Short mmCIF file of C-alpha atoms and ligand atoms in Angstrom, two decimals:
data_model
loop_
_atom_site.label_atom_id
_atom_site.label_comp_id
_atom_site.label_asym_id
_atom_site.label_seq_id
_atom_site.Cartn_x
_atom_site.Cartn_y
_atom_site.Cartn_z
CA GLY T 1 -4.48 42.27 -45.73
CA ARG T 2 -8.15 40.68 -45.38
CA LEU T 3 -10.74 40.99 -41.95
CA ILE T 4 -14.13 39.47 -41.21
CA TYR T 5 -17.06 41.55 -41.46
CA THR T 6 -19.64 41.13 -39.27
CA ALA T 7 -23.32 42.64 -39.98
CA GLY T 8 -26.70 43.36 -37.74
CA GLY T 9 -27.02 40.87 -35.34
CA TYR T 10 -29.62 41.37 -31.85
CA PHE T 11 -29.11 42.82 -29.04
CA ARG T 12 -32.13 43.91 -27.21
CA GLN T 13 -33.42 44.21 -31.17
CA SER T 14 -31.70 44.51 -35.45
CA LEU T 15 -28.66 45.73 -34.81
CA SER T 16 -27.81 47.93 -37.58
CA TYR T 17 -23.82 47.56 -36.76
CA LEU T 18 -20.84 46.69 -39.58
CA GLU T 19 -17.54 46.49 -37.77
CA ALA T 20 -14.58 44.68 -39.35
CA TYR T 21 -12.07 42.65 -37.20
CA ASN T 22 -8.16 42.51 -38.36
CA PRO T 23 -6.79 38.85 -36.89
CA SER T 24 -3.21 40.34 -38.09
CA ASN T 25 -3.77 43.35 -35.21
CA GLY T 26 -6.64 43.25 -33.27
CA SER T 27 -8.14 45.50 -34.61
CA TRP T 28 -12.68 46.84 -35.15
CA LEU T 29 -13.38 49.45 -37.16
CA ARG T 30 -16.88 50.05 -37.13
CA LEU T 31 -18.17 50.83 -40.93
CA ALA T 32 -21.07 51.87 -42.48
CA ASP T 33 -24.43 50.63 -41.53
CA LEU T 34 -26.62 48.68 -42.75
CA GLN T 35 -29.40 50.63 -44.38
CA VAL T 36 -31.63 48.82 -42.66
CA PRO T 37 -31.96 46.97 -39.09
CA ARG T 38 -31.44 43.33 -39.73
CA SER T 39 -31.45 39.66 -36.78
CA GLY T 40 -30.96 36.75 -38.33
CA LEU T 41 -29.59 37.61 -41.55
CA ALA T 42 -26.25 35.82 -43.18
CA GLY T 43 -23.17 37.54 -44.93
CA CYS T 44 -21.28 36.22 -47.83
CA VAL T 45 -18.82 37.48 -50.36
CA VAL T 46 -18.51 37.41 -53.75
CA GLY T 47 -15.94 39.23 -56.50
CA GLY T 48 -14.48 41.19 -53.10
CA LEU T 49 -18.25 42.43 -52.60
CA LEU T 50 -20.36 42.00 -48.88
CA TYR T 51 -23.24 40.77 -49.12
CA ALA T 52 -25.90 40.48 -46.04
CA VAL T 53 -29.23 38.40 -47.37
CA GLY T 54 -32.14 38.48 -45.57
CA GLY T 55 -32.84 38.48 -41.98
CA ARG T 56 -35.39 40.50 -39.84
CA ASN T 57 -35.71 43.86 -37.93
CA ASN T 58 -37.07 43.16 -34.34
CA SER T 59 -38.12 46.48 -33.39
CA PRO T 60 -39.74 48.33 -30.99
CA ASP T 61 -42.28 49.48 -33.43
CA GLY T 62 -42.88 46.05 -35.74
CA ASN T 63 -40.87 43.24 -36.90
CA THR T 64 -39.99 43.10 -40.03
CA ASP T 65 -39.31 39.70 -42.26
CA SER T 66 -36.17 40.76 -44.64
CA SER T 67 -36.38 39.98 -49.04
CA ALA T 68 -33.55 42.12 -49.19
CA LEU T 69 -30.13 41.51 -50.32
CA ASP T 70 -27.54 44.22 -49.62
CA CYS T 71 -23.46 45.30 -51.21
CA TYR T 72 -21.01 46.53 -49.25
CA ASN T 73 -18.55 47.27 -51.46
CA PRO T 74 -14.88 48.06 -49.19
CA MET T 75 -13.11 51.16 -51.66
CA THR T 76 -16.39 53.62 -51.18
CA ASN T 77 -17.69 52.40 -47.92
CA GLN T 78 -20.96 52.34 -48.79
CA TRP T 79 -23.83 49.90 -48.86
CA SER T 80 -26.12 49.37 -52.28
CA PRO T 81 -29.74 47.98 -52.19
CA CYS T 82 -29.40 44.65 -55.29
CA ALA T 83 -32.58 43.12 -55.87
CA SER T 84 -34.79 41.15 -53.39
CA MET T 85 -35.21 37.70 -53.18
CA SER T 86 -38.91 36.27 -54.12
CA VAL T 87 -39.48 35.98 -50.09
CA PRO T 88 -38.63 36.80 -46.64
CA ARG T 89 -36.11 34.40 -45.13
CA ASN T 90 -35.20 35.13 -41.59
CA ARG T 91 -32.50 33.09 -39.71
CA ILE T 92 -31.49 31.94 -43.53
CA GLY T 93 -28.97 30.67 -44.89
CA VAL T 94 -26.14 31.59 -47.79
CA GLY T 95 -23.36 29.36 -50.09
CA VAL T 96 -21.46 31.16 -53.45
CA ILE T 97 -21.08 28.62 -55.81
CA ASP T 98 -19.14 29.92 -59.08
CA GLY T 99 -20.31 33.46 -58.13
CA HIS T 100 -23.95 33.27 -58.03
CA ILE T 101 -25.60 33.27 -54.05
CA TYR T 102 -27.85 30.61 -53.06
CA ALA T 103 -30.63 31.33 -49.66
CA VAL T 104 -31.37 28.38 -47.77
CA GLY T 105 -34.53 28.43 -46.08
CA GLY T 106 -35.45 30.76 -43.49
CA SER T 107 -39.22 31.66 -42.11
CA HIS T 108 -41.30 34.72 -43.46
CA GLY T 109 -43.86 34.85 -40.30
CA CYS T 110 -45.06 31.18 -39.20
CA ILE T 111 -43.99 30.05 -42.95
CA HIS T 112 -41.27 27.44 -42.44
CA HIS T 113 -39.32 27.47 -45.88
CA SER T 114 -38.16 24.86 -47.97
CA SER T 115 -37.45 26.79 -50.98
CA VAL T 116 -33.85 28.68 -52.84
CA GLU T 117 -33.83 30.72 -54.61
CA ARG T 118 -29.95 31.63 -57.09
CA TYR T 119 -28.47 35.49 -57.55
CA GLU T 120 -26.13 35.99 -60.05
CA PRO T 121 -24.35 39.19 -58.99
CA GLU T 122 -23.90 39.69 -63.68
CA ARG T 123 -27.61 40.36 -63.93
CA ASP T 124 -28.76 41.45 -60.72
CA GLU T 125 -31.37 38.54 -60.63
CA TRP T 126 -33.08 35.95 -58.19
CA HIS T 127 -34.58 32.68 -59.71
CA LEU T 128 -35.66 30.27 -57.84
CA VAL T 129 -34.48 26.49 -57.29
CA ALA T 130 -35.21 22.98 -56.80
CA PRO T 131 -36.66 23.30 -52.92
CA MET T 132 -34.69 21.08 -50.58
CA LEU T 133 -36.09 18.04 -48.98
CA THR T 134 -37.04 19.67 -45.45
CA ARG T 135 -38.33 23.30 -44.39
CA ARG T 136 -35.16 24.70 -42.40
CA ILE T 137 -34.81 28.30 -40.94
CA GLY T 138 -31.96 28.49 -38.74
CA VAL T 139 -30.17 26.46 -41.66
CA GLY T 140 -26.58 25.93 -41.90
CA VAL T 141 -25.01 26.42 -45.47
CA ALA T 142 -21.59 24.95 -47.04
CA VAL T 143 -20.34 25.05 -49.70
CA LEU T 144 -17.49 22.28 -51.32
CA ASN T 145 -16.17 21.06 -54.37
CA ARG T 146 -19.07 22.65 -56.06
CA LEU T 147 -22.08 21.39 -53.81
CA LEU T 148 -23.67 22.94 -51.78
CA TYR T 149 -24.76 21.19 -48.14
CA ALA T 150 -27.72 22.62 -46.03
CA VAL T 151 -27.00 21.41 -42.18
CA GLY T 152 -30.09 21.21 -39.02
CA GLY T 153 -31.94 23.75 -38.74
CA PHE T 154 -35.20 23.89 -37.47
CA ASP T 155 -38.74 22.78 -39.83
CA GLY T 156 -41.53 24.33 -37.43
CA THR T 157 -42.06 21.52 -35.04
CA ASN T 158 -38.69 19.91 -34.32
CA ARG T 159 -34.67 21.13 -34.50
CA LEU T 160 -33.21 19.01 -36.76
CA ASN T 161 -30.30 16.70 -37.35
CA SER T 162 -30.97 16.11 -40.43
CA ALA T 163 -28.40 17.92 -43.50
CA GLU T 164 -28.85 16.87 -47.21
CA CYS T 165 -26.44 18.84 -50.87
CA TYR T 166 -27.54 20.12 -53.94
CA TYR T 167 -26.15 18.91 -56.93
CA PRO T 168 -26.11 22.15 -59.17
CA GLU T 169 -26.04 20.21 -62.25
CA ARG T 170 -29.23 17.41 -61.34
CA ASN T 171 -31.06 20.66 -59.65
CA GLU T 172 -31.45 17.74 -57.57
CA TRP T 173 -31.12 17.72 -53.21
CA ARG T 174 -30.63 14.75 -51.77
CA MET T 175 -29.93 13.34 -47.47
CA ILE T 176 -26.73 13.24 -46.72
CA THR T 177 -25.75 11.54 -43.20
CA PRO T 178 -27.65 13.61 -39.88
CA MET T 179 -25.18 14.59 -37.42
CA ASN T 180 -24.90 13.00 -34.28
CA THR T 181 -26.34 16.79 -32.26
CA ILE T 182 -29.41 18.22 -33.27
CA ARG T 183 -28.02 21.71 -34.46
CA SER T 184 -30.30 25.18 -34.84
CA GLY T 185 -29.35 27.92 -35.41
CA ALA T 186 -25.56 26.63 -35.08
CA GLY T 187 -22.20 27.66 -36.92
CA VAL T 188 -21.99 26.54 -40.75
CA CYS T 189 -18.55 26.35 -43.00
CA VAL T 190 -16.22 24.36 -45.21
CA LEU T 191 -12.90 23.57 -43.86
CA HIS T 192 -10.40 21.59 -46.14
CA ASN T 193 -11.97 18.80 -47.18
CA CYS T 194 -14.77 19.02 -44.16
CA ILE T 195 -17.84 21.12 -43.28
CA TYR T 196 -18.44 21.85 -39.60
CA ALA T 197 -21.43 22.27 -37.59
CA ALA T 198 -20.02 23.87 -34.19
CA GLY T 199 -22.58 25.35 -31.87
CA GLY T 200 -26.85 25.62 -32.16
CA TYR T 201 -29.62 24.77 -30.13
CA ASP T 202 -30.85 21.22 -29.60
CA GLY T 203 -34.09 21.80 -27.90
CA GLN T 204 -33.18 22.20 -24.87
CA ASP T 205 -29.59 24.24 -24.49
CA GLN T 206 -27.47 25.88 -26.55
CA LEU T 207 -24.39 23.61 -27.19
CA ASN T 208 -20.81 23.95 -27.28
CA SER T 209 -20.28 20.65 -28.94
CA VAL T 210 -18.34 20.53 -32.69
CA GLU T 211 -18.61 17.64 -35.58
CA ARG T 212 -17.34 17.47 -38.47
CA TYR T 213 -18.82 15.80 -41.83
CA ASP T 214 -15.72 14.01 -44.24
CA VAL T 215 -17.56 14.13 -47.99
CA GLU T 216 -14.77 10.71 -48.66
CA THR T 217 -15.88 9.39 -46.06
CA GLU T 218 -19.89 10.77 -44.83
CA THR T 219 -19.32 10.68 -41.45
CA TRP T 220 -19.66 13.12 -38.79
CA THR T 221 -16.78 13.12 -35.57
CA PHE T 222 -16.82 15.45 -32.62
CA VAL T 223 -14.23 18.11 -32.51
CA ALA T 224 -12.41 19.71 -29.13
CA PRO T 225 -15.89 21.60 -28.09
CA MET T 226 -15.76 25.72 -28.70
CA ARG T 227 -15.50 27.39 -25.05
CA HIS T 228 -18.90 28.63 -24.76
CA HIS T 229 -22.30 26.56 -26.02
CA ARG T 230 -23.85 28.90 -27.99
CA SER T 231 -26.95 28.68 -30.40
CA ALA T 232 -27.02 32.07 -33.19
CA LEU T 233 -23.45 32.03 -33.72
CA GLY T 234 -21.52 34.13 -36.63
CA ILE T 235 -18.81 31.61 -38.83
CA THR T 236 -16.31 32.19 -40.73
CA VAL T 237 -12.79 30.66 -42.36
CA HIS T 238 -10.04 33.61 -42.16
CA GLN T 239 -6.54 31.94 -43.67
CA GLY T 240 -7.27 28.38 -42.44
CA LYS T 241 -8.82 29.03 -39.41
CA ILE T 242 -12.34 28.50 -38.35
CA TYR T 243 -13.89 32.43 -36.15
CA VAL T 244 -17.07 32.69 -33.91
CA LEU T 245 -18.65 34.91 -33.20
CA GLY T 246 -20.99 35.92 -30.86
CA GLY T 247 -24.62 33.85 -30.69
CA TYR T 248 -26.22 33.40 -27.11
CA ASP T 249 -25.51 30.61 -24.21
CA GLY T 250 -28.93 31.26 -22.61
CA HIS T 251 -27.37 34.54 -20.10
CA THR T 252 -25.74 36.91 -22.48
CA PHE T 253 -25.35 37.53 -26.28
CA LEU T 254 -22.00 37.07 -25.91
CA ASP T 255 -19.29 39.43 -27.61
CA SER T 256 -16.74 36.54 -27.73
CA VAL T 257 -15.35 36.05 -30.48
CA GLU T 258 -13.19 32.10 -30.61
CA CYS T 259 -11.57 30.47 -33.46
CA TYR T 260 -10.40 26.42 -34.11
CA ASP T 261 -6.66 25.18 -35.30
CA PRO T 262 -7.23 22.72 -36.27
CA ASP T 263 -3.81 21.06 -36.82
CA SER T 264 -3.46 21.00 -32.36
CA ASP T 265 -7.09 20.57 -32.22
CA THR T 266 -8.37 23.60 -29.79
CA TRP T 267 -9.53 26.26 -29.81
CA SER T 268 -8.70 30.14 -28.51
CA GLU T 269 -11.11 33.09 -27.23
CA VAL T 270 -9.29 35.14 -29.73
CA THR T 271 -11.78 38.20 -28.96
CA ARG T 272 -14.51 40.49 -28.01
CA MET T 273 -17.25 42.06 -30.18
CA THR T 274 -17.19 45.79 -29.14
CA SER T 275 -19.97 45.00 -27.58
CA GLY T 276 -22.77 41.06 -26.96
CA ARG T 277 -24.89 39.63 -30.28
CA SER T 278 -26.61 37.37 -31.63
CA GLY T 279 -27.65 35.72 -34.96
CA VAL T 280 -25.29 38.83 -37.17
CA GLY T 281 -23.59 37.88 -40.88
CA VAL T 282 -20.22 37.07 -41.23
CA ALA T 283 -17.91 36.87 -43.90
CA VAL T 284 -14.23 37.88 -45.18
CA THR T 285 -12.87 40.75 -47.84
CA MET T 286 -10.45 42.64 -48.25
CA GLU T 287 -9.41 46.01 -46.00
CA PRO T 288 -11.58 49.25 -46.70
CA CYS T 289 -9.21 50.52 -49.06
C1 5UI B 1 -30.27 33.89 -29.95
C2 5UI B 1 -31.60 34.12 -29.38
C3 5UI B 1 -32.32 34.50 -28.10
O1 5UI B 1 -32.37 35.27 -29.99
C4 5UI B 1 -31.89 35.36 -31.47
C5 5UI B 1 -32.17 36.95 -31.50
C6 5UI B 1 -31.91 37.50 -33.44
C7 5UI B 1 -31.69 35.80 -33.79
C8 5UI B 1 -30.90 34.80 -33.77
C9 5UI B 1 -31.34 33.11 -35.12
C10 5UI B 1 -30.27 33.58 -35.80
C11 5UI B 1 -30.25 31.74 -36.25
C12 5UI B 1 -30.89 31.01 -36.17
C13 5UI B 1 -31.81 31.44 -35.24
N1 5UI B 1 -32.49 30.53 -34.10
N2 5UI B 1 -32.89 29.66 -35.52
C14 5UI B 1 -34.11 28.38 -35.52
C15 5UI B 1 -33.98 28.10 -33.55
C16 5UI B 1 -33.47 27.40 -33.14
O2 5UI B 1 -34.17 27.97 -31.96
O3 5UI B 1 -34.37 26.49 -33.63
C17 5UI B 1 -32.84 29.21 -33.77
C18 5UI B 1 -32.43 29.71 -32.36
F1 5UI B 1 -30.50 30.73 -32.58
F2 5UI B 1 -32.25 30.77 -31.51
F3 5UI B 1 -31.94 29.03 -31.46
N3 5UI B 1 -32.36 31.99 -34.61
C19 5UI B 1 -32.05 33.94 -32.22
CL1 CL B 2 -36.13 35.96 -34.98
#
């Protein structure tokens, strides 16, 4: 069986929680805390290992943007540090291609990054690649057909509807069709041949809307909206279903977890996180042992 892992997040301050949800039975496990609290991080999995990337420790005793990469092994229930990134990246996006981790955008204080770097687990090494055409924090990232997409975000001045694609063999970014909605701090993932962008902040409101980009038609189509408006949500795919976790609706740090069934085009309440939080990192791997 495989679990949905949520790492870190924010409520009152940045959080160190690592908790795993089992869609088969509805259960939550609390697992080993992150060594350093962090919100605005991303999660990913490579070789059955869970990685937590970037973020920020918003704490009463100060605010520290994170360049950290840390690895969680479900077999041992232990976190280990990996090589740090070139730069702190709060409100980061990440994607995995061919066993490598791409770290995209994010902020360091008032620095809004367009830079991108790639981590190679085999060598515990980061290397910068071509920067994006746009500065993007709160950027959504997904991978389809070994191409990397950076979607929406905030450039330091404006929230963005724009999106762009990275072609690894050309080390080159190109713009794609923009979304039909401005979205910053959305959830972005892949399902089938489509990039989905769920929720976000448009500069005025948290969004419940959801749209998807078909790489073959180069067009975005709205699907059914989520049951909750949310920015700074976590998102993942577990057995062909999209799950969204937490976020902020303009009133409450949400504990709501919803899942999308593409065949019926419906969103369902699935479970509640143990506590409301925004800006988590989320990914899916094996059960501890
Ligand atoms: C929800 C907000 C009031 O408290 C937090 C706290 C910690 C992290 C986060 C977060 C996480 C991921 C992305 C974003 N980003 N990035 C840009 C933006 C924007 O405004 O453009 C946002 C937004 F969600 F906050 F919405 N934030 C939000
Ligand atoms: Cl923040």
